[PDB]
Amino acid sequence: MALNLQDKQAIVAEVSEVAKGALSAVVADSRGVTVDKMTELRKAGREAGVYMRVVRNTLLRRAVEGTPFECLKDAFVGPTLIAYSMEHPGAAARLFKEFAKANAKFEVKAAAFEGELIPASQIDRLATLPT
Amino acid sequence: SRVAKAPVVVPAGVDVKINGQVITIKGKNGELTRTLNDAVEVKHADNTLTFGPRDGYADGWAQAGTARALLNSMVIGVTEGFTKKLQLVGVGYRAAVKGNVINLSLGFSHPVDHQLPAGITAECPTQTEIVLKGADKQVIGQVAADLRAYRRPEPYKGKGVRYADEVVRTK
């Protein structure tokens, strides 16, 4: 790893996205494929383009640092690999259920699609979203 | 150094005997006893082993790390079992096991009979292959090494006996 300039900036940019975020989902790509990477992220570029962030930095001292500042209840990401998919436009878009629908599409492990905490809920299969 | 720091967990059904320095880790897959270099002692805890060095010795952590790995070679052996695969390739090569010895038609004028040690057994699922099962790393590695000493493969065709893990280079 290089020095600490970009590490602070990367987290700060992620924190600034939380203020303009929406409902997000999770995925655990321990055994991922670039072809599958061009499926759930090509949809992200399909909607608007490059603005979507799927940065995977769930280390105990990388993404947990921004938890006390925003979404304090999200401190339970300390366990194993968890990914984020943050949406700036729209409230509770259909991208949340995309990972659950793509779980069986050669994506056997998807972090059990535990999702995020917009209402401070638990692991559930949510399909009633504004369309 | 760092190897000795990491704790080691022992499975169930295996006992640890302490008589000073000599240790017995008899389990469900045989029995064996090994000794250290009279510089690192052994201590028994609830579910882990701590060894530590002793003062006055320059090496210290150097041989302490070997201790756990030496145990690591014989804590899973009495629990899981050790299997090494040897491949025999070539026309006219014959391999079989009878009793506790192995007869090899490796192209000699007389068959080669190698006596296996007591704690290691052999079996041939197919005629051209053999599997070696033992209880400790130190002996099973040499027995496989001794077998390859007869037919150390040449770098031209790969003919002879070789491990399945390694790939013989051809030139």
């Binding site: 072809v35 061009m38 992220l41 090509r42 992200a44 570029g45 399909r46 909607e47 608007a48 383009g49 490059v50 050669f106 | -």
Partner: protein, 141 residues
Amino acid sequence: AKKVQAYVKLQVAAGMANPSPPVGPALGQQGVNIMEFCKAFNAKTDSIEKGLPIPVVITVYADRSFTFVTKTPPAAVLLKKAAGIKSGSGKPNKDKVGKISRAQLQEIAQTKAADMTGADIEAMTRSIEGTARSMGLVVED
């Protein structure tokens, strides 16, 4: 797109009839024949035009025949017939070989059937030109 499945691709052009001196019988030797190059391969290629080489996957597992689908032609094979010279690089960077305008490779790059990485049209607008200036070309975007 699932496993290795022993996929190969080789061609020199679409207007030919599988010539030997360029490629030969190397179009498949693990269960792929040579007489099927004009039965199903020339089912959609012959419908539109034969002027651009087309690489394509094998996709053969246990059948004598094939079950693959053709894809888009390369971005640089078009540089010979609709962009300018066709002799080749010659001098790589001793001087400026040719000139490329923003009009060129702008609307033709959108003709790809199934080749896309996101809906950002601007993304591959300058990426189709990414293949350019590999021979001594000049961009005029």
